[PDB]
Amino acid sequence: AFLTVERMESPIDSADDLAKQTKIEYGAVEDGATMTFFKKSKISTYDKMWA
Amino acid sequence: IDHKADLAVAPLAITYVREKVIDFSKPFMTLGISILYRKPNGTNPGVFSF
Amino acid sequence: IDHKADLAVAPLAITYVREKVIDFSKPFMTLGISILYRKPNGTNPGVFSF
Amino acid sequence: LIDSKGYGVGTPMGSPYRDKITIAILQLQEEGKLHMMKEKWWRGNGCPEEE
Amino acid sequence: LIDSKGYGVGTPMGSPYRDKITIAILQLQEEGKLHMMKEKWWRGNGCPEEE
């Protein structure tokens, strides 16, 4: 069934899911609006994203 | 702020610093941060593969 | 319309019909319509399914 | 999503509270407490209800 | 989505043109005009899928 239907899908589907794993590198626009927002955001999962 | 160009139709985000100096109209479009990553072309890695 | 309340704070989408009549603040919760449907209940439970 | 319509609060046509509330809500958006504000009344009560 | 920023025009304090342009853009949004354009320059090639 897997061979016939080939439900290929990356394990990441959410920001928290992205934060849990570390194999795939992350990032955003350097000195961009997004990363500046990540400053002081202090969400329980986005602080680790900032680091 | 100097009123040289009164209208500012442009993709300028409504930020607190900008709003202090110039007022913005209501957002025609509400943008937000998302996650960008390639299309999932699944590959099966050995032990997980079988 | 009659200034009993100097600020009418309430959950209400910004609309054309009301904006001309009374002023609305910036969108504190952007949203829209959506479609709700029951989760697909597969026939997974049941040890006799084999 | 289907529609593009965000909530708002009534304000007199020339009330000075309009710009003050605008500044306050942009500050709330920037600081990020609006996310937990949404969560407390939307996701916080669903803490055991999740599947 | 992660955050809920917004775009728009820049105007000075209490610009009379702002309070009419916001009504105009609300009218266009409720008329659906701003969405067909919001998809016009996006689907340059669509989604080519074979599976």
Of D4, D6, D23, which has the smallest distance from its Cβ to B16's Cβ?
Answer: D23
E35 to chain D: which residues are within 8 Å by CB?
Answer: 4
Of E4, E19, E30, which has the smallest distance from its Cβ to C15's Cβ?
Answer: E30
Q: Which of D43, C39, E42, D40 is nearest to A14 (CA)?
A: D43
Asked if E35 and D4 come within 8 Å (Cβ–Cβ), the reply is yes
Asked if D6 and B15 come within 8 Å (Cβ–Cβ), the reply is no
Tokens, residue E40: 């016009």
Header resolution in angstroms: 3.9
CA angle (D13 as vertex; D8, D16 as ends), nearest 5: 85
Residue B10 is labelled as binding a ligand: no
Q: Could you please report the per-residue DSSP string of A1-51?
A: -HHHH-----S--SHHHHHH--SS-----TT-HHHHHHTTT--TTHHHHH-
Residue A28 is labelled as binding a ligand: no
The one-letter amino acid code at E47 reads C
H/E stretch holding D42 reads helix D33-42
- Any idea what DSSP says for residue D45? G
Is residue A15 a contact partner of residue A49, using CB atoms and an 8 Å limit?
A: yes
Asked if B12 and E7 come within 8 Å (Cβ–Cβ), the reply is yes
Q: Which residue has the tokens 């029951």?
A: C38
CA angle (C25 as vertex; D26, D37 as ends), nearest 5: 50
d(CA C21, CA C9): 16
For testing contact with chain C, the best of E22, E28, E33, E35 (most C CBs within 10 A)? E22
Q: Could you please report the per-residue DSSP string of chain C?
A: --TT-S-B--S-B--HHHHHHSEE---SB-------------S---TT--
d(CA A28, CA E48): 28
Across the strands, what pairs with B24?
Answer: E10
CB neighbour list of residue A12: distance below 8 Å, 6 or more residues apart: A18, A21, A24, B35, B37
Q: Which residue has the tokens 């061979």?
A: A3
Q: How many D/E residue pairs have CB atoms within 8 Å?
A: 11
Across the strands, what pairs with C8?
Answer: D10
Interface of D with B in 32-51 (CB under 8 A): none
E6 to chain C: which residues are within 8 Å by CB?
Answer: 26-27, 30
Which experimental method was this entry solved with? cryo-EM
E15 to chain B: which residues are within 8 Å by CB?
Answer: 6, 23
Alpha-helix residue ranges (DSSP H) falling in chain D: 17-31, 33-42
Q: Supply the Cα-derived Rg of chain C in whole angstroms.
A: 23
Return the number of other C-beta atoms located less than 10 Å from residue D19's C-beta.
Answer: 17
D12 touches chain E (CB under 8 A): no
Exposed, middle or buried, C40 (CB in 10 Å: 0-12/13-18/19+)? exposed
C40 to chain D: which residues are within 8 Å by CB?
Answer: none
Residues constituting chain A: 51
Q: Which of C14, B31, B23 is nearest to E23 (CA)?
A: C14
CB neighbour list of residue D3: distance below 8 Å, 6 or more residues apart: C31, C32, C33
Is residue C7 a contact partner of residue D8, using CB atoms and an 8 Å limit?
A: no
Across the strands, what pairs with C24?
Answer: D10
